[PDB]
Design a binder for this molecule. Structure first.
Ligand SMILES: [Zn+2]
Ligand SMILES: [Zn+2]
Ligand SMILES: [Zn+2]
Ligand SMILES: [Zn+2]
Ligand SMILES: [Zn+2]
Ligand SMILES: [Zn+2]
Ligand SMILES: [Zn+2]
Ligand SMILES: [Zn+2]
Lengths: 339, 339, 339, 339
C-alpha cells in the first residue's frame, strides 16, 4: 500500500510503498478515503516533543474510511461501516480514568499517527472498540476535520461549563477557532470572537459570532467588560503569553479560562488575582468517544461546517511548509482516493 | 469604646478610645467578645496591597459577639443573638454573583476590617443580612477562627470536587492547614499532609492525616504517586513557587490544584502538561454565608477544632511582630473581655 | 385606583375603586402597565386549593410596570425603572433555601396575587428586592407572560438536565407548551412536540419542533422509541394521568420526567420499572430571580415569543370564563392603561 | 462441578453435578469461594417477575472467587486474580448508556444468576471486562455482600446528592439498611435510622446512626421535622406504601427520595405537593464497575462491615425458607468450600 512516512525527524516525508497491515483479535482494517492534517502531525514529524514518536512513522489521527475486514471478537462493527480513527487509538478500558468516562487520560493509551501508524496511508490497522462511526449524511471530507479539531473545540466548550445564554470568548479564529464559534452557537451560547486579523473576524461574523474585537486595534478585555460585563468563559485556541493574559483578563469572576493549544513555554498567573476572583484555568484536549459522536452529530445536522482544502497525499510536505508559514486558511484534508 | 486602630501604614496600631458606632436601616450593633487575628489584618496594617484600606482603620474580620441592638427593618436578628462578622461585610444582593450564590465575588462588596471598621474593638457596626449566627454549644473563642480560616479551607475542599473516599493533599499544616486536615476527614476524604517541619506532620497525624511526607527529606510528588497513585486534588495553604510546583506534580490527571494563599509573585504553569493532563488550577478564598454556617456546624459537632492562643487587644502589635517572624503555631484570638 | 377584586370565592370579580397602596422600608410602588392572566389566578378566585388566599384579593402575579416611587433603604431601583412582580413576591433571604439559590422554596414566602395584592390594578406595592427588571427592548405586553409561564418552562428544562444535542419531549403545546418548545431550541435541544390537536402540532413545527406526534393517532412513546431511541427527558405541561403515563414511557433509561402542572389527583408510578430503569420524577414550578432574568434575556434576544391576546381589565371575568372552557389559544394579557 | 440449580420455578433447588463451564474470547473461568444470597435470587427461583429467568438456572450474583484461567484477548486479568461477578454480568460497551458511565442501564446487558448461570456453584464462566477485582485485605466472605447490597446502597446515597454535613434518612435497617448507615457516615453524612424494631435501631446506633426513630411509637416525619428540620434526602431500602409515604413526608423541600426496593405494587404520589415542594423521586439499583470498586474500597479501609452468616451451598433451600419468613438478621453468604 501507498503511504506517507517519516523515516527521520525534520526530514521530508517519503511517499512510498509499504506492507499492508494485517489484523487480529479486536482490530479492524480500514481503507482510508481521507485524513485531516493536524499541527500535531507536524510536531510528530519533527519529533520536537519530550515524548518522541516511533520511527518509521505513518502520521495522521484524522483518518476516515471504510472497514475492509473485522478481526476475531469484533461484533459491533461490520465490513462496510464508515468510521474514523482519532488520536485516542486505544485505551486500557479498566483504569480509573477509563471507567469514569475520561478515557482520554488513560496512561496506557496508544495514539494514532504517533505511537502507532495512522491515516496518512491507504490502509490502517485500528482497535475496533476505539474507532468511531460516521453519520450517514456526512462525507468523508467533511467528517475528517471533526475527528480532532471539531471534537477538541466541542469538548473545550463543555469544559467551560457555560450554559445556554452565557457568553464565551473564542481566542483565535483559525483552524480550530472557526469551528469553535459554530459549536458554541449550537450550544446556545453568545460568542465574542477575538483575532488580530480583521479577515478572520468578518469570517467569524458570517459563522455566527455576536461580537468581534481586534486586540491590535483595541483592548480586548476592556471591550468585553464594557460590552457584556466580562465573558463567562474563554477558549484559547492559539495559546501564547499575550493571548492567555488577555483571555485571563476578559473573564468575569468565577469564570473559566480553557486552554486548547500546545505551546512549549510557561504561562505566569497572578496568584492574588486568581484566588480573589475565583478564576479557573483548565487544559483540555481532544475528547472521548462519546464526545466525538456528539461532535459528529452536530455536523450531520448542519450546525457546524469546516472550511477545508483537499489535497492529494503526495502534497503532504507542501502542506506542512504552508502550515509552518501560516499560509493556510482553514483545514487541509488529504485524500488517498482517486477522485 | 476601646479599639486597636491603624492611623498610618507600617506604624504600630494605637489602642485608644474612639466613638461608639451608631446604626440605622438594616444594621446591628455588635458587642465584640473575641476576634481572630488573620494574616490579612497584617497586610491591611501595612497597606502593601494594590487596593489599600481606608484610614484610620479598625482591622478584624474574625469578630464574634452579641447583638446589642438592631436597626429598623431587621427581622431575622434579635438582641442577644450570638453572631460573627466575616470578611464579606456586605454585598449588593442583586448582581449575577449575588443571585447565583457567589456573594463572595460581588464587585460591590465591602470588607470587614479593610474598607469598613472591623472587630478589633468593643463594638462594631455590621450589616444585618451578612452577619452569621454562632451555634449554641460553640464558645466565642472557638468560633472566631472559623469565620475566616475555617470557612476558607472548608470551601477550598468543596472547590476541589473531591468526593468521599478520594485522596487530597494538604500543603502546609499551619494556621489554615491543621484545620483543613480536619474538614477533609469530616468530608469523608483521605489525607496526605505535606510540610517541611516534622513537628507539624506529627500534629497532622494526631488530627487525622492518613499519610505524611516531608518535602525536605523526600520527593513529595513521587511519594504520592507511589503510595496512592496521585491525589485527586491538592489544597495549597502556603502558596510559594516550590510548593505549587510540587502540588501540581502530585495530583493525578484531570485533578484539581486549589490555591488558597495570597502571595505577590507569579506562578509559571506548563501549558503542554496542563492541557495533556486535563489539570485544573483554581483559586479559592473565604466562602459564602451558607459555607460559613456549614463550617461552623462541623465545629459545633466536634469534628473540627482550631489550635488557638488567646491574647488581649493591647498586645496586638506583639502578635503582629510574632506573625511576621513565623513565631506562631496555630491561630491567635484577641479577647475584648477586659475593656 | 381602579382594580379587579375578588370579594367572595366563586363570585365574579368586581372592577371598582380602592385605596392606592402606600409604601415603606424596602418597598416600591409600581404603576402597572400590563398583567398576564394565569390559571393560578382562576384557582385563587375560586379558592379551590388547600391553602386559600386572603380576601378581598387583587389577583395577578404577572404584573409589569414602572416604579413610581422607591421606599427608604432601596438603592438598586430608581423611579422610572421597568420591572415585574412575579409569584415569588418576597422571601426571608436567610433560611437554607434562600442562601442556596432556592428562594422559590422559602417557607416564609409571600405570593403576589394570592397572599398579598397583585397586578390586577393600576398600582401595586412590591418588595424591592424581589421585583425583576425588564430588558429595554422588550414591551410590557411581551414581558408579562414570561414572569410566570416563561420562567416556569425555562426552569423546568434546566431541571431536566438535558444538554445541547439531547432530545426532550414537550407534552401539551398550549399556554406553557408553545413557549417551552422555543426555550428548548434556544437551549440547544432537539424537540418532540406531543399534543392531541394537530392544530397545535403544526404550530409547534413553526416554533421549531423537530418531530411531532398525536397520541390519539399513534403511540407517542413507541414513536419516540423508534424515531430517537427515547427522549432524554420530558416536560409535562398539561399533567393528567394518561399524559404522565405516556411521558413516563417515552423517556429513555436514566431519564427525567419533569412535571409542571398542578392537578388535584394522584399519579401512580411503577416501583419496579422506576428502580430498574433509573428514572427520575421531578416537580418544578416558576423560578428564582436569576432564572427569571435569564428567561427574559432570551425573549429580549428574539429567541422566544409568546402568542398573546390583549384584553382590558374590565373583561377579566370574560377571560376566566373562556379559560375554564379551554377557549383560549396562547396567553391573555390584561392592559391597565386606563383610569 | 457441584452446583445449586433451579429446574422448575417454586420448586426447591437441586444440589447436583453439572458440566464445568468452558470459556472463549473475552471470558475467564472463576473458581467460586463464596456467594452472597440476595432476595433477587429468591424471586428468580420463584420466577415471579415479568421477565422470567432461563431454566435450568444456577442463581447468584454475589459470587467471588479466583480466576483459574483467562480466555483469548483478555489482558487486564491474570490467573490468580481475586474477583467477583456482579448482577451486571456484561453490557455491550457501545450504546449511549455504556459510553456515558451508565452501563447498568444497557439494554443489551446479561445478568448473573438470572439470564446466565451465576455463583451458586464451584465454577462460573464470566465476561472478563465486567468482573471486579477484590481488595487484597478483604476476605471473600466480607467481599461477597458488597457486590450487590453494598454497591446498591453506596450508589443510592450518591444519587441522593447529599453532601458532607447534610442529613439523610435510612428507612429499614436490615440487609441493605445496616450497610447504608455505614456508607452514609463514611460519606460525611448525618443519619436518621428508621425501623419498626427497636432491636434494629440499637444496632443502627452502634453502626453510627446519629438519630433513631420507630414509626410505631411516634410520627417519624414529625420527629425529623422537629429534630433536624427535615432530612435532605431519604433512602428507602424496604419499599412499601407506608414506608414511602413516611419518607416522602420527612424530606425537606427540594429534597430527594431514593427507592432501592423492588415491590410489585404502585406508589401514589401527590402531584400538588411534589411540584410545589420540588421533591424528587429517584429509583436506583446496583451500580457501575466504578461504583463497585469504590464501595469495595470503603470496606477494605474498615469503614463498612456487613453482618453476615456463613452457610454451605447445600443449605440454600433452608436459607430461602428463613428468608421468606424474615428469620434472617443481616446477610447470608454461601461457602462452596466445606472448610
Ligand atoms: Zn490533532
Ligand atoms: Zn485506561
Ligand atoms: Zn452583588
Ligand atoms: Zn482572613
Ligand atoms: Zn402563575
Ligand atoms: Zn427563606
Ligand atoms: Zn442482588
Ligand atoms: Zn451498552
Amino acid at each position: 500500500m501507498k503511504a506517507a512516512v517519516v523515516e527521520q525527524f525534520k526530514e521530508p516525508l517519503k511517499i512510498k510503498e509499504v506492507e499492508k497491515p494485517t489484523i487480529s483479535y479486536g482490530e479492524v482494517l480500514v481503507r482510508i478515503k481521507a485524513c485531516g492534517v493536524c499541527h500535531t502531525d507536524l510536531h510528530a514529524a519533527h519529533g520536537d516533543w519530550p515524548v518522541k514518536p516511533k520511527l518509521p512513522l505513518i502520521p495522521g489521527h484524522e483518518g476516515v474510511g471504510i472497514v475492509e475486514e473485522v478481526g476475531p471478537g469484533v461484533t459491533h462493527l461490520k465490513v462496510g461501516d464508515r468510521v474514523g480513527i482519532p488520536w485516542l487509538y486505544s485505551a486500557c478500558g479498566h483504569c480509573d480514568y477509563c471507567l469514569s468516562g475520561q478515557e482520554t487520560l488513560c496512561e496506557h493509551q496508544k495514539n494514532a499517527g504517533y505511537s502507532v501508524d495512522g491515516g496518512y496511508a491507504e490502509y490502517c490497522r485500528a482497535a475496533a472498540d476505539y474507532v468511531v462511526k460516521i453519520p450517514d449524511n456526512l462525507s468523508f471530507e467533511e467528517a475528517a476535520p471533526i475527528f480532532c479539531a471539531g471534537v477538541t473545540t466541542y469538548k473545550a466548550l463543555k469544559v467551560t461549563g457555560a450554559k445556554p445564554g452565557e457568553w464565551v470568548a473564542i481566542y483565535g479564529i483559525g483552524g480550530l477557532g472557526h469551528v469553535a464559534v459554530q459549536y458554541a452557537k449550537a450550544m446556545g451560547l453568545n460568542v465574542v470572537a477575538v483575532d488580530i486579523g480583521d479577515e478572520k473576524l468578518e469570517l467569524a461574523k458570517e459563522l455566527g459570532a455576536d461580537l468581534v474585537v481586534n486586540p491590535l486595534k483595541e483592548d480586548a478585555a476592556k471591550f468585553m467588560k464594557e460590552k457584556v460585563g466580562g465573558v463567562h468563559a474563554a477558549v484559547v485556541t492559539a495559546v501564547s503569553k499575550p493571548a492567555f493574559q488577555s483571555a485571563y483578563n476578559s473573564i468575569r469572576r468565577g469564570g473559566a479560562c480553557v486552554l486548547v493549544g500546545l505551546p512549549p513555554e510557561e504561562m505566569p498567573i497572578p496568584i492574588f488575582d486568581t484566588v480573589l476572583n475565583g478564576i479557573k484555568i483548565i487544559g483540555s484536549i481532544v475528547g472521548t468517544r462519546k464526545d466525538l459522536q456528539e461532535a459528529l452529530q452536530f455536523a450531520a445536522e448542519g450546525k457546524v461546517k469546516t472550511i477545508i482544502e483537499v489535497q492529494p497525499l503526495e502534497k503532504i510536505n507542501e502542506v506542512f511548509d504552508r502550515m509552518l508559514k501560516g499560509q493556510i486558511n482553514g483545514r487541509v484534508v488529504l485524500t488517498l482516493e482517486d477522485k
